């Protein structure tokens, strides 16, 4: 059905009305989203059906119709834009300077913006517009504020 490059909402009709569970990126004929958004389940796009191809619960990522295509990385210095797609609201770019998540296995970029859970999967962008990662897997700190990791997969 719809294979056009761009940002998409992930919806369900299982609960009351139409509910937005997350967001995703279509690029090179592949749909990229967060594992916790779909739980690996098949997707519908008009008359078309998207089946999962690769996924990993620990990375919290899933690709549909083909392998993971997004490979751009945060440079460690520059400001980025969250292309936020909130539930029932229009797509909006929010510029911010990322923080850092320090882990026993290496440092990762982090974005400190407050958005409802249905915004998981919204892409994070570099100055050329390349997707450096997805927003929506992180932690809730001290006052109920949200900090997400900059989650990127590996292109084969």
């Amino acid at each position: 059905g719809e294979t056009t490059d761009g940002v998409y909402r992930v919806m369900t009709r299982r609960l009351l009305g139409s509910t937005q569970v997350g967001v995703g990126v279509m690029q090179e004929g592949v749909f990229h989203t967060m594992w916790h958004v779909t739980k690996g389940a098949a997707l519908r796009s008009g008359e078309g059906r998207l089946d999962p191809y690769w996924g990993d619960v620990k990375q919290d990522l899933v690709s549909y119709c083909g392998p993971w295509k997004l490979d751009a990385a945060w440079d460690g210095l520059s400001e980025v834009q969250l292309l936020a797609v909130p539930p029932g609201e229009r797509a909006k770019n929010i510029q911010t300077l990322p923080g850092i998540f320090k882990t026993k296995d290496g440092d990762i970029g982090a974005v400190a913006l407050d958005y409802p859970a249905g915004t998981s999967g919204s892409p994070i962008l570099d100055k050329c517009g390349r997707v450096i990662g997805l927003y929506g897997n992180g932690v809730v700190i001290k006052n109920g504020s949200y900090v997400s990791a900059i989650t990127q997969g590996k292109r084969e």
């Binding site: 719809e2 056009t4 490059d5 761009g6 940002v7 998409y8 909402r9 992930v10 919806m11 369900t12 009709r13 299982r14 569970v21 967001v23 995703g24 990126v25 690029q27 749909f31 779909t38 389940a41 098949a42 997707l43 519908r44 796009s45 998207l50 292309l83 797609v85 229009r90 797509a91 892409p123 962008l125 517009g129 997707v131």
Partner: peptide, 10 residues
């Protein structure tokens, strides 16, 4: 069943 809707350009 889950489905996708276009939300904009990157």
């Amino acid at each position: 069943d889950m489905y996708i809707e276009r939300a904009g350009d990157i």
